[PDB]
Amino acid sequence: SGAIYVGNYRVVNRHLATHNDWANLVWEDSSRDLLVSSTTAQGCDTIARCDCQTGVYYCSSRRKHYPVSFSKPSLIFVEASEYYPARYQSHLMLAVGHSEPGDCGGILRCQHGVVGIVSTGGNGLVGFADVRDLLWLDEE
């Protein structure tokens, strides 16, 4: 589990979105595994605006933050998980590291702020759904 709280937005994995998220929907995209809902309170998470390929992510299944290299956001084939069939996922970054389904929502951060959230796992890789292209998270 986990979310990003930026301005009056809440960013979660689409597969973990609640009823309240859907009842306050701003934007969602199944191919990216992202959903954004509106918040009453202002969040303070800074979104990275950059092309960094190094950062640190939180792994809830290890109670640890790990430094990783990661690929630029791409369209990748993802093998079946507990929560999605085998399919293509877009705007996805991969690193070598540990990820189990419960790890989804863990923050990946660089020197510029929040890069994205854990979205995929298995075969010794961790996949992160990028948010750095969502420039509207910063406004309205």
Q: Which residues bind Zn ion (CB under 5 A)?
A: 48, 50, 52, 110, 112
Query: How big is the CA angle at 107 (ends 21 and 97), to the nearest 5 degrees?
Result: 125
* DSSP-H helix ranges across 1-87: 19-23
Of residues 98 and 112, the one with the C-beta less far from Zn ion: 112
Two tokens, residue 132 = 């750095």
- Least CB distance from residue 116 to Zn ion, whole Å? 11
Catalytic residues: 15, 33, 104
112 is in an annotated binding site: yes
Q: What end-to-end distance do the CA atoms of the chain give, in Å?
A: 26
Of residues 17 and 92, the one with the C-beta less far from Zn ion: 92
Of residues 4 and 48, the one with the C-beta less far from Zn ion: 48
Within its chain, how far is the Cα of 93 from the centroid? Answer: 10
Detail the residues annotated as belonging to a binding site for Zn(2+).
50, 52, 110, 112
Question: Which residues fall in the annotated binding site?
Answer: 50, 52, 110, 112
